[PDB]
Every structure is written in structure tokens, then in C-alpha cells.
Design an enzyme around this catalytic site. Sequence first.
Site, short mmCIF file in Angstrom:
data_model
loop_
_atom_site.label_atom_id
_atom_site.label_comp_id
_atom_site.label_asym_id
_atom_site.label_seq_id
_atom_site.Cartn_x
_atom_site.Cartn_y
_atom_site.Cartn_z
N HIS A 1 5.51 14.77 20.82
CA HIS A 1 5.88 16.14 20.39
C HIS A 1 5.90 16.24 18.87
O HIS A 1 6.76 16.94 18.33
CB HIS A 1 7.24 16.55 20.97
CG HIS A 1 7.23 16.74 22.44
ND1 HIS A 1 7.09 17.99 23.02
CD2 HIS A 1 7.44 15.87 23.46
CE1 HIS A 1 7.17 17.87 24.33
NE2 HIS A 1 7.37 16.59 24.62
N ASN B 1 11.05 21.49 28.65
CA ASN B 1 9.58 21.65 28.58
C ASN B 1 9.24 23.06 29.04
O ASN B 1 10.14 23.74 29.51
CB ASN B 1 8.88 20.55 29.39
CG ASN B 1 8.56 19.32 28.56
OD1 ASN B 1 8.49 19.37 27.33
ND2 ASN B 1 8.34 18.19 29.22
#
Lengths: 502, 502, 502, 502
Positions: free
Chosen positions: A72, A145
Amino acid sequence: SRDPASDQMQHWKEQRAAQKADVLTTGAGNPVGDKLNVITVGPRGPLLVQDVVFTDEMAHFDRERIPERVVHAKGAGAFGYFEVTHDITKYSKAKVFEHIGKKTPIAVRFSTVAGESGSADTVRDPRGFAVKFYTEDGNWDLVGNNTPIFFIRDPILFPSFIHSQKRNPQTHLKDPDMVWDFWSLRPESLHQVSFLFSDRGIPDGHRHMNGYGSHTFKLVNANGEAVYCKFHYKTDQGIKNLSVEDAARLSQEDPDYGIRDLFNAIATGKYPSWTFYIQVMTFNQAETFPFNPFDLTKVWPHKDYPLIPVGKLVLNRNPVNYFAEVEQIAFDPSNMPPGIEASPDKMLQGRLFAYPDTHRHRLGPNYLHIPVNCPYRARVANYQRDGPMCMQDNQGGAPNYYPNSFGAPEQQPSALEHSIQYSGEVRRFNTANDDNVTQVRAFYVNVLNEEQRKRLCENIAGHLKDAQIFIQKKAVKNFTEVHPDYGSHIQALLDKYNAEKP
Amino acid sequence: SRDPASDQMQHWKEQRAAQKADVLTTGAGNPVGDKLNVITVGPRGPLLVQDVVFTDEMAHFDRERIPERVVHAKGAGAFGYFEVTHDITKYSKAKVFEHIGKKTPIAVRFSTVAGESGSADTVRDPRGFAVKFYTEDGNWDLVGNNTPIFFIRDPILFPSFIHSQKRNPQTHLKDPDMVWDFWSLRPESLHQVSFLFSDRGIPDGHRHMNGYGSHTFKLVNANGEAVYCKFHYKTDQGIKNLSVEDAARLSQEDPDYGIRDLFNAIATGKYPSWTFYIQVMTFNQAETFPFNPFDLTKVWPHKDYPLIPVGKLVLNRNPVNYFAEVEQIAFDPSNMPPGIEASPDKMLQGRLFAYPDTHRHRLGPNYLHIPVNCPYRARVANYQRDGPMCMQDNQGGAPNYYPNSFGAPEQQPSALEHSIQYSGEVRRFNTANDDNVTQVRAFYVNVLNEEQRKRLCENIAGHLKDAQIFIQKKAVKNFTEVHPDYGSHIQALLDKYNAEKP
Amino acid sequence: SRDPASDQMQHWKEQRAAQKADVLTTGAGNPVGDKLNVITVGPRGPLLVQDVVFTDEMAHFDRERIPERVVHAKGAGAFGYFEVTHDITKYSKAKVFEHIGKKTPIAVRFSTVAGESGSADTVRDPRGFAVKFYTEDGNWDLVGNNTPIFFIRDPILFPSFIHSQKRNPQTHLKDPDMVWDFWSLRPESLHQVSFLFSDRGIPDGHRHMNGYGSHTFKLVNANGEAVYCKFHYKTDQGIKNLSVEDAARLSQEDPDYGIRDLFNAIATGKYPSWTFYIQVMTFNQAETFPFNPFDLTKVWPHKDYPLIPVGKLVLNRNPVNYFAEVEQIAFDPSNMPPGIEASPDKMLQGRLFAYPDTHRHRLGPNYLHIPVNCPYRARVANYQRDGPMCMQDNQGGAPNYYPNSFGAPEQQPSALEHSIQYSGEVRRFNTANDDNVTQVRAFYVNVLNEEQRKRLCENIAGHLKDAQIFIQKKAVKNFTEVHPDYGSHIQALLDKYNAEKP
Amino acid sequence: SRDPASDQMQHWKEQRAAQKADVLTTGAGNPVGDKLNVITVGPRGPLLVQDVVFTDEMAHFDRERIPERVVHAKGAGAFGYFEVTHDITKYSKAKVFEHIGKKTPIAVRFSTVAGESGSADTVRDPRGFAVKFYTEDGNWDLVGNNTPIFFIRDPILFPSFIHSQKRNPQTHLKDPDMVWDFWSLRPESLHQVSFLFSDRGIPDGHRHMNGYGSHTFKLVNANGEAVYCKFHYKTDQGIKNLSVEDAARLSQEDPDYGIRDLFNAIATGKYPSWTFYIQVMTFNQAETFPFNPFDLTKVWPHKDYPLIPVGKLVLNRNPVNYFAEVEQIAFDPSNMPPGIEASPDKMLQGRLFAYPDTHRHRLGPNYLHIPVNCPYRARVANYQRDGPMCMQDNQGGAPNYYPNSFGAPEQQPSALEHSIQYSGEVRRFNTANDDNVTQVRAFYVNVLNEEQRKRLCENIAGHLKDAQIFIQKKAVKNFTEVHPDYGSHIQALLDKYNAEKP
């Protein structure tokens, strides 16, 4: 006048207005006479060590970069608040939910998963949707998410999964053999692979996607009664996806599409919101749920477990400095105030360890004192001392051992965790051959229409065509187990691609 | 009631008074129910990962230690102020000296040189006397010793000198062969070795010793006229030394003698002061000075260069947290506001590089943002950004390149350094065979009396007896060159010690 | 000729013999013309940046120090082997024990607990006795003490215990109030406090003390049958202790007494040995043991659990470089080959986390590749990649995800851990009020004679006299619970000391 | 069978052949029974701390990332050799040039400048072309670009230049205002901006571009005679450029185009070579050169200073592990063996400091011991010791101070640097208004044809159109000073773009 993002510097100059320029200083606040030229022995002579302006500046420049997030890495951040709109105090004693209209400041970072810092926003990937709530009972990090599920159900596979999704260790190229060898060997991935290769695999920026906590959490109320929950934060701007063709165009034209979209939305007052829901499952329902309710590859169907509304997330503020507020922000799933606890989801248990651990490497031991990470609506009082880059007073002359007879901070028994009995041997239990297809079939058949199934199969075949035939075979076998038409449609497209391949 | 140091915790409890104990939190401000017991599977079962209280605490404990200073590791700190008592604005435009009675806050750290963090205070060593002045033109670090001179005159020898003074690389023992092999080969050391082995080699705590800048600095006035100066800060408590016998006793009974003495003095209102003097030498006097006036092994004799009083240093405050304010404090000789500059003393030039460099390792890139190091009476405004543990706002959205058209900070031409022409080739010039004895002889003959010469020779012989004979010979030869009686008295004591040695 | 330690450099020169001196190089292997003088603009000019010899050297010097160990900072190391002398393959399948006469190389580090790097060896403290066995099934770290027990039985108290034993956070002085406030509030400490203040509290160097694993471990044999064990390594040089008076003298005269003693013993061929024993307790005996057999404040009495001999530890080699082999060595209790496992001792469970965690801070992520830490008699093959200071080939182009279809390393099912069922809720169980006195009384009465009881009480009173009266009272109360004569003898000495105190 | 890059894993499996899979171990070489499942309390219970396999693996994963290079983050590496083909021993005594046919191993890293690690290869940027020569006189790092010049001539502007080329500090977007505000204010940039926006601004991979040392260096021969030189390494594959349209397509389709191209070339035996030339200028020619010959914005025209051939660079080996050999490789321009030295080019002087400094942050103090950085054809022998991640023996028990009487390494007077006298005051000399246009005009008129001038102006206008009008005006003014047609053609295209802009 252009978009607000393009006018960042012009706007900064305008705010300054009549103000004279600040004096240019060294790091130690010593004014600098000239920062355009170095000290030399005459006009064509060598550079002198006593040019400390040069060295101060250059030494800082040399140290600008910190390690990127292991996953990420590429992200966009914003600030705003969470507002309670309904009472769930029956389920949770958490102060963040305490009363209707209670506002809590939040920080959010949106991200892709596999891309490094310079990679394009508009690529096929899960998106991270991490929310930090600055509560009076300390920070609560909901590190979500844009999907309710994940590719794996055991955390010891996580490093392998991320390795398979990143670059070949020799060539430094993305490797379809690695991607599809791993997925074809771990068919628990089919559910999240189906979501990934569907239309929501490439959202139209961050404002047009849902967030999920994904894991089962445990809510505990003031009477010490526990339920299990899922957290859902559904976009109020509506789901919107880029086509593969538009996504590809934007990857070249605007690698920072998501950053720009979000910055411009908030700069022009179009404050994106999400409605925050929970699903609740009682401990008795958890005993009788057809799957493992703590299995990160499974959802709780909406008919059996309807969404209970809780509140609203609003992002109304851009970061002033990206490095200070977005690069340095750290979310720990283990940062849970009283009333919210870990379920025994094996994946959540792994995440309880990994995030503080990577934060101490990426940012430093004292990363919780970086302003964006500081629990600034709580008083931090404890027996932790020292470590590099110790800021504030290091708790002054307070006694540094517990227990003590000198009035230093005291445990708060109401903050004690909820107790459960667990049945079985302490050992490694295989979960590879838990149900890998039932909910994937429900998705393929009941949720996708015919057009959507066609694009799903075209998106998969287009990626999987690059893997070796033995991997293509094993991948298609797993897709066939979901539904014969899923497998056969993919195999048909592969036959076409493998024929074109010389 | 005991000494104030012994009553630190009792006093802390008393100040709290009726106040309820703070709630014990995790690093992220989450209240802790119980910090006395871990979560286990029943009362004799294994420890659970979801014990994040345990892991948060233990992970912080695991990271408490930072690297000790490469030299001057063992120290005592205090706070107070510098007050101007005389006008030297004819010599220096520096704001710290601007007008009579101008008070500037200071931070001081006293230290030995070779000892590690747990070593005894009352040992034979030079003492560090570092002063940080928080001025409006940024911090000024005067990083002084308790001696006007040093053992070497070229900075490339510094690591070798410190290695010879520390532990054998194989045995990890202090090694007289290493100490005396180095000194006997580098006779420029004789002047500081004479001071070291005299009575002032073991001061009676930090309050009873002088500090010196040691180096020649350059003062520049408002008209851009430069002189050279030395800084002297003479104890107002008077010089007082421990006998070798008392020093040895205290090394065992009170390893932290100096820390305790200073803390107790300030806690009981006995605020130690030093009178701050300069010696001035004009650029013409520097041309005609019998030695190199920039040679760190030489003093400026007081008859030719009398002490001009400037002000007073007063220490009136103890650190609240030793780690935060003394362990983490960083002094850079390169932190010089306008009106104070480096001379071409080769040793000072080396120190311009080494201190920021070691600070970035020991503390971190952003060590100037640690509160004790922050130039908090100056506005830091520049083009430096990011780096690990970036605190504050990282200068917000200000333009980060220079020059720019957007009103970000600007160079201040009045802060420009003083220009000089230098004659000669750019190369390595040997200074080993500069005068090594003249001023040492002046010290032995004119400054020490007969009793003092006897103790000087007894202190040297007692250390040097442990070196190999070939090293003893070369050492005594160098002492003989200072004065035949210096060498012969040492050789006489060595003959006695070497005879007792089987 | 002196002791071998004193002759380290002379011996190094002699081994070189006729060999010409190596050429002096920079770090990058570039030969250095002159390392005694820096490059300047003529003989009294400023220092040039293009003096990279100077900068290369100084920059390395600036970075020499790593963080000291958070505990056990001051140490001595040596190398040798473990030899099996008896068959315990009935209890353990571990390759280290495989057959009689099997030799395994070892590394040992001896240490005190609370002292920093420069502190004296001959002080009252527990001693660390850490042994690394380089086996073919990887390293086994037995990280033992010179005592079979510890001060606490729950690991969440460890940071508090160490804080109380170190310096006051404000004054940076050792604080008897902190030491005795903590012990008086945690009477589980009485057993190890009794051992600490007895004669074995100050061993005569490292060769004259026992080591213990202290914890209960689990041995598993080739049939998958488990027992619990303790490890004991009893000195073959015999127990010998310094008197308080000699210990105090040596603390001043020879702070590095233990380092010197051990180095000189091995240099002169007097190779110290220890006999390695186990005590065994079956799972049925663990159910019926009068205390918690996993309680680190309890021993297993020798009559019920006799010592079974296993082998011999011999130290026959000194480190060549102390920093490389002793400062950088890292022992992880979690480094256990197959056949040896953790018991559910809560303290051992805490240590499974803390050591790798502190090693990654103190030494770096890749600290297991530092030669002394490398499992050099095992092939390391896994899916771990990268991290700072990655040495060797980083496992070349091997597939970096598991499972894979490309023949990269495979799990070995025989290496699977032993499974157990545990009864009870997952929660924090109080162990403060487990039995704190029974075994302490056995020690006071049955193990110490009258002379030893007198010195025990004199050693305690001499430390405890400096604590506040309220702490003295609570301390004496706990000693009285062990035995009225223990408490009363201490109170009698305190009355004498508190009367002398003005 | 696909391209060799795509077949990396298949080829790795094939080389293994009949070999059984290695046993999967922990970091400490302990065999792992199962790496697919974690230890839990029964099949739906929480995760245990004694799962050290999980923690060992996860903790390593958490630490995989190191800081990216502050510039030139995105790169491709390869190995090969430099072969001497001509005698230049008249100019340089450097062993790398010693005799015809002498082969020296090399390492090369190609890179873009501004892109982060995940950015596209086929973008408009200067390319880095860094060559490490492993000579017997240590490593020589020639850290070149694909252009003979740079944008700035003073190193104190470097951080500002790189800031202006990277992301807005608030929005984290690339900012044309920042890029063109900086260039328009610093017209010394016109020469390298002209090269940048020409066809060679986007090479067709790394094999089809030249490298230059860019700086003037100094060659010194065995008689101690010095000349100045430039190094040129001209592609033997021929110059080839991507069109803007193909570059844009590839940025989306193949972000790793350059890595893939180079890996595939070497894997298929198409070993790319470069011819290594010098230009020589005598100290007398340097006095009479129409510009500053040490000005990094100026070339030496080929008619006055013809290319003297020296040798050939050949790349014949791919990295086995990208992280180990390309991510961790470090080039220091200060790594110059005897016979090669720094000129007084101010930019080169800055680079003498900055690279070791950033290497100690990015890689660690002991980064020269990472195998790819090790001077493995030289014996490193010096007085540098310790620092984190100290590998090998830390030079064993060798004396660690200089000078010494014990036969440790010795300075080599033949390796002494060349001495020069320099005329002028030690101060900051303005070089902003050195000639900014003469050589740029020679390039526009004499080197580019009409088609090339049109694309140059189209490429500039396409970037500059996004800057504010006031910046466009100042930019066009500077282009007009080069040549009226340069400025006017750009202004014409801007008028078209600014009209289309609403």
C-alpha cells in the site's frame, strides 16, 4: 485559474499577501547570507568544509527518503470526521459511538496494494481504505479494504502472497507465473480474485468505492456482553468504475489520478461521505453459521445479517503537507479502544503483530508521537520511556516502574478485555480445504449479470494468458469448480490468446 | 528528608498532591485494564498474540537505547542563562552580546572523554563543557573542554587518538601500550598530557573547573571588521580538585559523583556560575605571533592577550527528564550565529563536519527538532523537507525550491561570512614538527610549584609504568625535551616501578 | 612479558613477523598517500571538501557506536564446544544430543544485568550466561543466568523491574527507593533477592559460577513423547565468590576484572568447563507438583528431580575482535531446534517475542547474517528476502513465494511442534499471590548456615537502609513472612543504620 | 518458451534438475514443520506467541524495504568488464589503464532521475549511467549521465532543482509551475533543457544511449604531471530514441521497458558495448578556454578537444538478485584510485560529500561491505572499526590507531594527491551570470536540423503550456536569448495551447 491542485503555490503566495518573506535559516535557526553559491578558494578553486550552509542543506537532502510501506505504498490522504447518526450502545460501550451526533475527527489514507511509490493509481488492485478515529479512549484504526474479503485466510501466507504480486527477485519485472502459480495453488483466493477482476477492480478514484473492515470484530457493551460484527462504509457518491481502456489511458496521462481527484473534490467543497454500517452476529449464530464466521474469504449474507446504520464518515480537509500527514501516518489494527476487540480471525491476529512492528522500522520507535499518529484527544500516561527521537518531555520525572507507591498512572479495570473459553489442542490446523467456491458461485450467478460475467472472464484471461500452460490449466480447473461456465469461458479466451502467441 | 536527588520521587508525589492517578494507557492512548498479568490460555497455558498491551510495552522497552556518544558518553546536564555584563559589540555584531544585561537561555552538558555510559565520574580525563545559547539568530554551540588546549593539532588523528584512549579491539581492556605508544609517537600531546596528569586532571565535580572554547574563533563586527578570539569561562566557585586517593574511593562509592553534586547544588539554590571572558588577537598580531595562533596545542599568554570580560553563565535549573534533555542534547560547533565564525584552526575545521554527521546517526536526521536541540527563539524557515520522524508541519505547503516566484524564505545578505585571502598550495602540510615543548616548559617551570611537579611526575609514572620499556623510553625522551628534570623525575619513578614488577 | 591480555598488540606484531605492513586504504580500497595531515589552502588555510580520506575516516568514526543491550550491556565472550557424554535421546530427538562424544561448536557471553557498557564487573547482580550451540538443525540459544530463578513470574512486569534497577528518570542516579519500592510491592522477588544478597551475588569472575536455563523447557523424543526439563551447567572450576570488600576494591582497581580473568585463563590454556545436566519432569508429575512447575520463582528440588548428566561445555578460544564476536552476538531463546520447545512458562513466552525484536533494533533486520550469529552448520533456505544490509546473494533467483511449482524449499513435517490441550478461559490470570515464601524458607534454613544468614542480612540491610522508612517497613514485613529471624535480623541492622543517619 | 525474463523461474527449476528441494528453515537455520498454517487454540481460537515461525517470517517481511535513492530511484543493472584498447599511461598512472588488453570487472546501473521506484522507464528525463570499476587500487566509481552537461553549475542549488522536479509538497502531484519557475529563474539550465526536450530525452532503452562523466576530472601520470579530462562512453549499438507517442504507449504497456530490454539482450548473448574515450585539456589550455572549463553547463568542442580512445565497456552478465546487486549498489564519485582526481568543478566538489553521506543513511554505515560494493580486487586495511552490521572480522586484533609501533597498515606516499596553487579570496562567487546561451545556440543552429528544432519546440511547449503565464513569459524570454526562432516558435505553440485552455 486552473484546478485547485494546480494552483497550490499561487494560493500559498496569496495567503501570505503583504507579509515580507521569512528569513532563510539553517536547521539551527542561523540566518543564511547566500544560498545560491558555495564558498570556494577564489572563483575556480575547490569547495571549503566551512561552507556549513551547503553541508547542512545537502546532508538533510541526503536523508529525505524513508522506507516506503511494504504494501500500500502509493496513497492519497484526507481529514474529516465521523458523526454518530444511530444508537449501537446496546452492542458497544466504545466512546466513539457514545451518543447520536457525537463528532470524532478522522484521518483516511486510500492506497493500491502492490504498486511502489511512483506507480499509477488507475490499475487493477484492491484499494486500502484506512480510517484513524481520534477518540477520547485513544486512537481506533479501522484499516479496511475496498472489498469485504481477502485472497487468503492464514496470515503466514501473507508475505508469499505479496511476493507473488510484486517483482521477480532476479528480473525486477511483474511475473504472471508468480501471480497465477500462487493463486492456482491456493484456491481460497477465488472469491477475492472474482471481485478483483470484476468492474470494482478499478474504481473511478477513491470517492466512488466502499470500504470494509473485512474481518469479524467483537463489540462489547457496558454489561460485558459481546457480539461479533463486520464494519461496512458504503460510498454516498455511488459506485463508479473506470473501463479497462480508460484506466490504461489514465495510467499514462495521470498516474496520480486518485490523489488529484480527491484533493480537487475537497478543495472545491464536494466533501465525499460514506455511510458507516455494522452487521451483528451473536455468539450462538457464530456456532451455527454454515462457514467459519472468522474466515476472511467469506461474507455474512445481507438477508441473514442486515446492515445496521451507525454514522457517517466525511472528508472535508486536505493535508497541508503530504509527507507529514500521509506518508508518515501509521494505522495499527491493534489500536482498538474499549468496546471493540479482535475476533479469532487468524488474519486479524497476524495483523495485531505486523503493523506496530513495521511502523517501528518504517517510521521509528516513537512513531506514535508524529503529530498525525498522536492520540491527541487522549492523555498518554504510562511506563514507556526513551527510544530514538523522543519528543515532548518523555513523561518528565514521573516514576517509570509499575506498581509503585508514588502516584504514577494506574490500570483502569473497566478497560479489561472480554473473556472466552476455546476448545481444542494448541497446534497448526489446516484451513486450505475449507469451502473455496460456495460464496464465489453466489457472486458469479446471483450478483453479476451476463455482461459483467463476460468482462470478468475477459479481464482474467487477459492476465492469465501470460502464465505457463500448466498454471493456466490449474487456474481454469479452480474456476470450473466455481461454475462450469466460469471455467469454460476463461478457457475459450485462453485458447484464442495462446493461438495468437507464436 | 535526604539530599534532593534521593527525594526525587517523594517530591514528584508531593507536587501531584490530591490529584487522582492518571489512567494507564497504551502508546495510542487506549486505556489498559490490567498491566500486571498477560493473557494466557487458562492459568498454565501459552501467551496470546492479542495481548497487545504486553507487546506495545515490550516492543517500546526493546528500543529504549540509542547509540552512546562516540566520545563524552558519560555526562551531567543543567539549564540557565548567559547574561552580558560588558560591551564587546566593537568586536562582534552577534545578538547574544547585543547589549549589557541581555539574558540568553543556555543548556550545558559536562562529560568525561573516554568513559562509556556506566563509567565513573571521578577519573583522570579532560572534561567536556558544552554550552548551547538559544539566541534570536539561532543556536550558538560553544563545545568547550576544561582545558584551553588538546592532545593533537590535526583532525585526521582524532579517531586514532580516541581509539588509543579506549579499549583494545581484541581484549576490550584499557591498554597503556595503546595510550603511550600513540602519545610517545605524537609529542604535540605533551602540553595537554602535562595538564591532564596535573591536579586539574580530576576536578571536584563540574562546578569547580574552568571551560575554554580551546580554538581560535573569528569575531566580526557591524562594520565587517574581523578579529580572532579565544573564549574562557572561569569558575566562580573556585578551582578544586580531588586527590588521586579520594578520586579512587569515589569511583567505587559514587560513580555518579558529578551528576549528584550538580543536581544537589541547583536543587538547594547554590546556582554555579562562570565568568565569560574573551582574549582578542588582531589579524596583524596573528601574522607576528611566535607560534601558529590557530594551533590547538598552544595558548595565547595572558600578558600579551589579557582576558576581556563579557558576561556570566549561570546554571539554575535541573533537567526534568535526563534522557529527553541530556542524553538527546546535540552541540554542533558549526552552529555559529552572525558575528562569530571559524578560524582556520585545522581541528575546528574537522569539528565543523563531524558533529552534525554523528548527530544524524546517534539521534536521527531530524535531531534539531528534538525540543532541547530546537532553536526555539528563532523562526526556522528554509527549503529542507521530510526525513524520518518529521515533527511539526514540515513547513506546510510552502514552496520547497529556491529561488522561487512565490514568496518563500529569502537569503539575508547581512548574514554573509567574512572573506579572507589565503597564500599557498592546496595540499597536506606536515605540522607534527611544529614547536612541541616551549609552552609545556613555561607550564612545568613558571606555573607548577615543586609539590605540583612531584605529583605531575608521580601521576605520569603510575600510568606509564604499565607500557612496554621501548614505549617508556620514547615517552621519557619527549618529557626530557620539555625539561631534563621532568624526564629524569619520571625515569626515576619508572626504575622503582619496573624493579618491583617481577 | 606480562599477562597475555596486556601483550595483545606485541603478540599481534610477532605473528606478522617479516611481513611488510599492509597498504593503508580508504573504505573503497583506494591507497592513502598520507593519513597524518589534512588538505588545506596553504599551511594556515581552511580544510578542503576534496580531503575524502579525512571525511571517509571521520564519517566511519562518527558511526562506530550501536545501541548497548537494553539489559546485560557489560559482557565477556569466548568460544568452544559442547561434547555429549551421556545418552538422553530417550528424552530428546535434538541433533545436538544425537550420540555420545558428538562435539558442537558454542559461543558464550557472560554479563551483569543493570550496568551500562562502562560499569564495573565485580558488583552485586545476577550474571547472564548465554550459550549459542551451532547445530546442524540451526542455532540453539540457551540464554541462561547464574541463578535457577528470577525476580518475577509475569513478563509484563519485566520492563518495570529493569526500570526500578536502573537510573532515576530525572537524576540519572541509581535509586534505592525505586529498587525496594518495586521488590517490597512484588514479594515473588524474595527467592531471587535471597540468592542475589547471598555470597553467589558476586562471583569471582565468570569461570566460578553455575549457569541455568532457569525456565522449564519441553524435550520431545523421536516417538513424539514430551517431558519437561530444566538445564543446569555447573562450574568444573568450583563455586568461588568475592567478599563485598574485595568486590568494592576491584570495582575501582579493575572494572574489567571478569573480561581479563576469562581472556587470561583461555590464553594460558586453563580452559574453563561446565558439566551440562537436565532435570526431567513427566507431564503427570507436572499435574501433581506442589507449585506451578512453570513458575520462574520456583526450583525443582534435587531429591524429587535429580540431575541427569548430558555433556560438558568447554571454552577454549578468545574472540579475535570483541566488537565483531561479543558486542554483535545475539541470542534468541526462540532459536530452538526440533526436540527442544517452550513450556508454557509465562516468562519464557515473553522472551520468545522480545529478543528477535530488540535484535532488529540493536543490530539491524539482517542481524542473523552477522558471522557470529549465522547458523553456519545449517543451510538457511526460505522465502525471506531483502531488508537493509542484505549480505550473500539474498538466495539468488530462487522463487520467493510458498507454495510454488518451481522446486524452492519445502516444509519438513518431522520438524512439527508437539501438540497439547489447555483448559481454561483466554484471559489475564493473577499470579501475584502464588506461594512467595516456601522455597525461600527452605533456602534460608536448610541451605545457608549461620555465617551465611548473617552476611545475607548484612548485605540486604546495607542496600535497603537508603530506602524511605515506609519502604523499609514493607520490605521487612515480606522478609518476616519467609522466617521471623530473616525479618528481625534485617530490622535490627536497619535500626542501627537509621540511628547513624542524621 | 517466451523471452528469457518471462522464463526466469522455469530456468531456475531446470538448473536444479534432479536435486531434492532444500529444507525450509527459519532465519536461525531451524527446520520448519509447516509454513502454511499458524498455531491457534483449537481450530477457531486465537494465535499463540510461541508461533515463532510466523513471527520470524512476518518480522522479516515487515523490514524488507530500505529508503529509495533520493534521486535515480528507478534503475536497471548489469555486470561485465572494461578492456583497455589504447595506451593513455602518458596522461594517467591509474592501474585500470595500466596496459593494453587489461580487463577490469565492472558493475553498471542505468536510471531515470525524478521517478520513484514504481515509475515508468520511457519518460522524458536525463538517464544515469553509473559504472563501478573493481580495480587493484580499489573501486573507481564513474557516476555518469546520458548527457555531457547538467542543469546547474553550483551544488547548493541541487536540492532545489530536484525538489522543483518532484512532487508538490502539499498535493503530491508533479507541478509544471515548480519545474518552469525554477528553470526560468536559473537560465544556466537552457543547455541541458535543450538536450532534455530533444530526441535523446527518451532513449530506446539503456543500450542505445551514450554515457558521460560530465565533469572535468584531473589525470595524473607517473611523473606527477596533471591534465584535465572528460570521459565519454559512446554506444556501439547506435543512438536510438522513442517517439513521444511510442514512449507514452510503453509507459502504460511496459513501465519496466528498460529493465526488460537490457535483461533480455544479455540473456540472449547480445552483449551491449560502449567505446570509452577521453578528451584532454592541459593546464595552459584551461587558462585560455573561452568559458570556465570546470562549468558543468559547458562542453569542450570536439574540434579543439578530440576524443582519444581508451577502451571498451561490455555488459555480459545479468544480476542474479536485483535487490542484492542493483538496489543495494552504491557509487561514490569520491572513489577515485591514484592517477584520477577531482577538478575544481563546484558540482563535482558537492558530489564528493553527498554520496557517502546518503549511502550511510540509505544502506548503513558499513555499506562498502555489501558484496556488490566491496573493493574485492583490493585488500582493505585501515584504522576504521565497528559500526552497525559489521561483517567479516572487523580487521581482527590489528592495532586500531595510527601511527603505531606494532606493524599495522602504513600510508603509501606514491598515492599522494597532485598539488595546485589557487588565486583569490575564500568566499561565495556568483556564477549565475556566466555565459548561459553561446553553446546552446551552437546546439540549436549547428547540431539540430529543421525537423529536430520543430520537435524540440513542440516538446517544450507541451510541458511549459501548464505553467502560469508569468512563468511562460520568463521561460520564452530565456529561449529568445538563445535564438529568436527558438523563443518565437515556442511562443507560437503556447499561444495555440493557451487559446484551447478555457
